[model samples]
Target: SGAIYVGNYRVVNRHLATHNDWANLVWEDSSRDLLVSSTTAQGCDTIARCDCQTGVYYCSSRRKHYPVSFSKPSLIFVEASEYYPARYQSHLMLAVGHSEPGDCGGILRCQHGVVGIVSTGGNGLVGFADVRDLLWLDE
Candidate 1:
């Protein structure tokens, strides 16, 4: 009874509001490399530069580095809330296969890259309810 379908892909999100009768979407067709976390969800401006194919993460404000095994991120959740503190609101977060170190859980906040409204539940809380769109594969 709880399956989230984005594009033809079948997935799940326990994070989305269970109260929402029927949720809407920005669109679909994006790949893992294209999905993002930001306020300006229009022109595809991911705050972090992660090329999964390249296994290179040009990420963070300080621009940190990881390992060859640290790439190929999967967009597990697109979390956001109509709240504040800028951290717990709006973001396109990621997940590697399992658990590891130096993984911010691939949490990237789209609302100007700040802290949470109580996020980092081992997950990202992109704390803003503004406009959002989806990116598909040449649809």
Candidate 2:
């Protein structure tokens, strides 16, 4: 087995929508011959073949919408590096949260190369209310 690297990021969408937000990054590999494994929010996890000539990798996921109270879904990206010579790479991680029904609370994280999403508030805490005006934290 090679090495597994994990990272996380947060994005706040003041509005709510049912679409995908784009996130892109450029990375370089220390070894000319290296492979990359990636996992993204909205259920996208796979091992990708890294381009030894360009040293670039790419992946994407679909956006999800939660209930009015839950607001919208968040996104994250986790990646692993493999091969020889070790690679020093800088990759882009994208997260697309809620953007419709006004204001809402959403969070995304990449833990140990795993991506996940979480919502806030108890049942009926804010019943029949719009997504906005909801106070949520990104952890």
Candidate 3:
């Protein structure tokens, strides 16, 4: 993988979408801080894959830290285009919250599980591709 830098973090793009609009897998550097922490006032826990449903949820990324809500799957505005439409089963939509412009591909995590990764953001909202929906090439 070719190494690239984003802000203070180094990342490597692993999986790109069919339309090449976004990346599904983004490997990050983990060797800098030995004791990185993400605890909040309530508490914190280790992250695992989530069986997320449609609802309001808390999520954080390398540049975003806020709450959001999953509204539906494969939003037309977010993923529909004749030339490069995003796949239906792999796309998801979430309610708007502020996020950095370059936060795409950053992991979206719930309290103890992963929701997905950033794919597109605009119109005061965001969209992602479902991790579970990805058809692994290795598989």
Candidate 4:
């Protein structure tokens, strides 16, 4: 397949290599926002925000704002690797409906702020892989 571009940066699949399904995207940029670009898949990008005291995710990118409903938490297993072996990853949450492949990598907004980022799904579920546990793995 081919990579997608956001402005001047190319979006690339990111993972531990050993964990094929543990995928995410990366762009060479310092500034980050609650923006999700699905232009390549859905022909549109979205900008969402969390209202501080609610778990409601509101997006203003459309003509009007709407809430991104979340269902329940799901559990997944990440494949074993050299440094980190196989284990079950929890606290994984999913959005209410189906999503396009490009929908992942967008910020997961909630009452406590950013809960995580969407890292899985397309046609089935919009799964959010918790990043708090993996933050220490990077420099």
Candidate 5:
């Protein structure tokens, strides 16, 4: 007889449908910051920012899924700052989502004298970062 993985058999449709199936996955590898969410999932949406200097990651999310209605759009924010010797620290920020009065949602922020923005409907994920900062680290 064939047997399935212990936990694998217990997996439900919802779990399989949502796990790793993000409507969008965005990130800034240089800063190790990322945001992942699913417009179709229930409560898997999240916004995360990482501070490599401190080795700490911060994240937030909409507690619940905002149904697709003509009103009440969702939004989020992710930002980070680091301090180095000789005041050599840098800041980073970004925004993702739609800003229309009747769209899905949106996120916005400013970091390190740079601004990152992303807006989406139901198509794909969006991301932004400071390529200059990553380049400077190589020096």
Candidate 6:
């Protein structure tokens, strides 16, 4: 633990790819079939890990909201083992999260007062949230 940083600066380099296996995970609904359909919306989506450097994050459509496929880079949270990458997995564990219109579980990043999301897919989509109070912007 350190405080989050603002700005578009990337914390780590993110590589986009497809992971059908990970997409097999569930969502808020905790249904394997639902996640499968959600993630595959554009294709196979999965953040897999938060391998991004540091200071990187997602921008949501509004403040303190669930991230979606169009989420943008903003702020990020980190923990031991740089498992921030693992955070993506944790986010996906929704109970009926999103549906045919959006992606399954993905990474969350914050900036200003909004948040963003980064998803892993086989074909398309890209990358939300709040926590403005939880961020640090000296850099």
Q: Every model's Cα RMSD, please?
A: 13.1, 19.9, 11.4, 10.6, 17.7, 15.7
Model 6 is weakest, by summed lDDT over 10 consecutive residues, at 28-37
Best-matching candidate per lDDT: 3
Better of 1 and 2 by TM-score: 1
For all candidates in order, the CA lDDT equals: 0.26, 0.22, 0.40, 0.39, 0.23, 0.26
Q: Which lDDT value does model 6 have at 137? A: 21
lDDT of 1 by residue, 16-129 (tens): 323332243333222221212212223332332223221222223234532222212223343343421233223333323322222222332323321111112233211111
lDDT of 3 by residue, 74-133 (tens): 534434433234533335556576544355555555554544555555667766544433
Per-prediction TM-score to the true structure, in the order listed: 0.22, 0.15, 0.45, 0.39, 0.17, 0.21
Q: Model 6, range 46-126, lDDT digits (tens) per residue?
A: 222232222333223222334333322333332223212333222221111232213322345323222323333222333
Query: In candidate 3, which residue pairs clash?
Result: none
The whole-model C-alpha lDDT of candidate 1 against the native structure comes to: 0.26
**Poorly placed runs, candidate 3 (over 4 Å):** 1-64, 79-90, 134-139
Q: Residues 1-139, candidate 2: write the lDDT tens digits.
A: 1122332222222122112322322221222111222225333222222211111111112144332222222221223422223222222222232232222222222222222212111233211111111112111
TM-score of 1: 0.22
TM value for model 3:
0.45
> How far is 2's C-alpha from truth in model 5 (Å)?
57
lDDT at residue 50 of model 5 (Cα atoms): 26
Candidate 4 off by > 4 Å? 1-13, 16-66, 69-74, 77-90, 132-139
* Top model number, TM-score: 3
| N/CA/C clash count, model 4 | 0
By TM-score rank, best first, the candidates go 3, 4, 1, 6, 5, 2
**Regions of candidate 1 where Cα sits further than 4 Å from its true position:** 1-22, 26-41, 45-54, 58-63, 70-138
Q: Write the per-residue lDDT of candidate 5 for residues 1-139, one digit (tens) a residue.
A: 0000111111111112234423342222222222222233233212223232111111123322221112111222323223112221123322232222122122222232112222222222222221223222212
